Symmetry: C2
Subunit: 74 residues, 2 copies
Protein backbone atom coordinates (compact mmCIF):
# COMPACT_ATOMS: atom_id res chain seq x y z
CA UNK A 1 0.00 0.00 0.00
CA UNK A 2 1.96 2.98 1.40
CA UNK A 3 5.20 2.52 -0.56
CA UNK A 4 3.30 1.89 -3.79
CA UNK A 5 1.02 4.92 -3.34
CA UNK A 6 3.96 7.27 -2.56
CA UNK A 7 5.94 5.82 -5.45
CA UNK A 8 2.85 6.33 -7.72
CA UNK A 9 2.46 9.92 -6.46
CA UNK A 10 6.12 10.48 -7.13
CA UNK A 11 5.81 8.90 -10.60
CA UNK A 12 2.65 11.02 -11.41
CA UNK A 13 4.37 14.22 -10.41
CA UNK A 14 7.21 13.23 -12.78
CA UNK A 15 4.69 12.64 -15.65
CA UNK A 16 2.99 15.99 -15.00
CA UNK A 17 6.31 17.80 -14.84
CA UNK A 18 7.41 16.29 -18.18
CA UNK A 19 4.03 17.30 -19.74
CA UNK A 20 4.28 20.92 -18.44
CA UNK A 21 7.98 21.16 -19.28
CA UNK A 22 7.40 19.94 -22.82
CA UNK A 23 4.45 22.24 -23.60
CA UNK A 24 6.65 25.14 -22.38
CA UNK A 25 9.25 24.06 -25.01
CA UNK A 26 6.46 23.80 -27.64
CA UNK A 27 5.67 27.53 -27.62
CA UNK A 28 9.08 29.02 -28.60
CA UNK A 29 9.45 26.18 -31.15
CA UNK A 30 6.13 26.85 -32.90
CA UNK A 31 7.31 30.43 -33.42
CA UNK A 32 10.75 29.27 -34.82
CA UNK A 33 9.05 26.83 -37.16
CA UNK A 34 6.28 29.30 -38.17
CA UNK A 35 8.70 32.15 -38.92
CA UNK A 36 10.97 29.85 -41.00
CA UNK A 37 7.92 28.52 -42.90
CA UNK A 38 6.85 32.17 -43.57
CA UNK A 39 10.17 32.71 -45.26
CA UNK A 40 9.90 29.57 -47.42
CA UNK A 41 6.41 30.71 -48.57
CA UNK A 42 7.93 33.85 -50.00
CA UNK A 43 6.38 36.15 -47.34
CA UNK A 44 9.43 37.76 -45.64
CA UNK A 45 10.23 41.38 -46.55
CA UNK A 46 12.68 41.62 -43.55
CA UNK A 47 14.56 38.44 -42.80
CA UNK A 48 16.62 40.46 -40.21
CA UNK A 49 13.59 40.81 -37.88
CA UNK A 50 12.41 37.26 -38.64
CA UNK A 51 15.82 35.88 -37.71
CA UNK A 52 16.06 38.10 -34.62
CA UNK A 53 12.81 36.71 -33.23
CA UNK A 54 13.96 33.15 -34.09
CA UNK A 55 17.23 33.78 -32.25
CA UNK A 56 15.29 35.25 -29.31
CA UNK A 57 13.10 32.16 -29.00
CA UNK A 58 16.10 29.79 -29.48
CA UNK A 59 17.79 31.51 -26.53
CA UNK A 60 14.63 31.36 -24.39
CA UNK A 61 14.38 27.66 -25.24
CA UNK A 62 18.04 27.16 -24.34
CA UNK A 63 17.39 28.51 -20.87
CA UNK A 64 14.36 26.17 -20.45
CA UNK A 65 16.51 23.19 -21.59
CA UNK A 66 19.43 23.98 -19.25
CA UNK A 67 16.93 24.21 -16.37
CA UNK A 68 15.46 20.84 -17.35
CA UNK A 69 18.89 19.30 -17.47
CA UNK A 70 19.50 20.53 -13.90
CA UNK A 71 16.04 19.59 -12.59
CA UNK A 72 16.33 16.06 -13.95
CA UNK A 73 19.12 15.47 -11.36
CA UNK A 74 16.92 16.62 -8.42
CA UNK B 1 7.32 -4.05 -2.92
CA UNK B 2 6.78 -4.77 -6.65
CA UNK B 3 4.24 -1.97 -7.20
CA UNK B 4 6.61 0.76 -5.79
CA UNK B 5 9.54 -0.85 -7.68
CA UNK B 6 7.70 -0.36 -11.02
CA UNK B 7 6.46 3.16 -10.23
CA UNK B 8 10.12 3.93 -9.38
CA UNK B 9 11.59 2.17 -12.45
CA UNK B 10 9.02 4.03 -14.55
CA UNK B 11 10.00 7.36 -12.91
CA UNK B 12 13.74 6.66 -13.40
CA UNK B 13 13.27 5.86 -17.08
CA UNK B 14 11.30 9.13 -17.48
CA UNK B 15 14.12 10.96 -15.74
CA UNK B 16 16.76 9.50 -18.13
CA UNK B 17 14.57 10.45 -21.12
CA UNK B 18 14.26 14.06 -19.97
CA UNK B 19 18.03 14.19 -19.77
CA UNK B 20 18.63 12.65 -23.18
CA UNK B 21 15.91 14.72 -24.93
CA UNK B 22 17.17 17.89 -23.29
CA UNK B 23 20.73 17.18 -24.54
CA UNK B 24 19.37 16.39 -28.02
CA UNK B 25 17.52 19.74 -28.03
CA UNK B 26 20.57 21.66 -26.87
CA UNK B 27 22.50 20.84 -30.03
CA UNK B 28 19.99 22.12 -32.74
CA UNK B 29 19.67 25.25 -30.54
CA UNK B 30 23.45 25.67 -30.74
CA UNK B 31 23.42 25.02 -34.49
CA UNK B 32 20.71 27.69 -35.06
CA UNK B 33 22.52 30.35 -33.05
CA UNK B 34 25.94 29.54 -34.50
CA UNK B 35 24.62 29.63 -38.10
CA UNK B 36 22.62 32.82 -37.43
CA UNK B 37 25.76 34.55 -36.11
CA UNK B 38 27.87 33.47 -39.12
CA UNK B 39 25.25 34.83 -41.54
CA UNK B 40 24.85 38.11 -39.64
CA UNK B 41 28.63 38.60 -39.73
CA UNK B 42 28.84 38.36 -43.55
CA UNK B 43 30.67 35.03 -43.47
CA UNK B 44 28.16 33.01 -45.50
CA UNK B 45 25.99 32.95 -48.59
CA UNK B 46 22.50 31.69 -49.33
CA UNK B 47 20.12 32.85 -46.66
CA UNK B 48 17.59 30.33 -48.01
CA UNK B 49 19.94 27.59 -46.78
CA UNK B 50 20.17 29.25 -43.35
CA UNK B 51 16.37 29.38 -43.08
CA UNK B 52 15.96 25.81 -44.36
CA UNK B 53 18.53 24.52 -41.85
CA UNK B 54 16.59 26.30 -39.03
CA UNK B 55 13.31 24.71 -40.29
CA UNK B 56 14.96 21.25 -40.22
CA UNK B 57 16.42 21.70 -36.75
CA UNK B 58 13.04 23.04 -35.51
CA UNK B 59 11.13 20.04 -36.92
CA UNK B 60 13.62 17.68 -35.23
CA UNK B 61 13.14 19.55 -31.96
CA UNK B 62 9.33 19.24 -32.44
CA UNK B 63 9.70 15.48 -32.72
CA UNK B 64 11.70 15.25 -29.52
CA UNK B 65 9.18 17.45 -27.63
CA UNK B 66 6.24 15.31 -28.81
CA UNK B 67 8.13 12.16 -27.72
CA UNK B 68 8.37 13.60 -24.22
CA UNK B 69 4.60 14.43 -24.28
CA UNK B 70 3.78 10.88 -25.41
CA UNK B 71 6.12 9.26 -22.90
CA UNK B 72 4.42 11.25 -20.11
CA UNK B 73 1.05 9.75 -21.19
CA UNK B 74 2.30 6.04 -21.52
K1 LIG C 1 12.21 15.14 -8.91
Amino acid sequence: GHMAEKARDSEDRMRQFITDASHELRTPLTTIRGFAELYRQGAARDVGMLLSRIESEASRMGLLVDDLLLLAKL
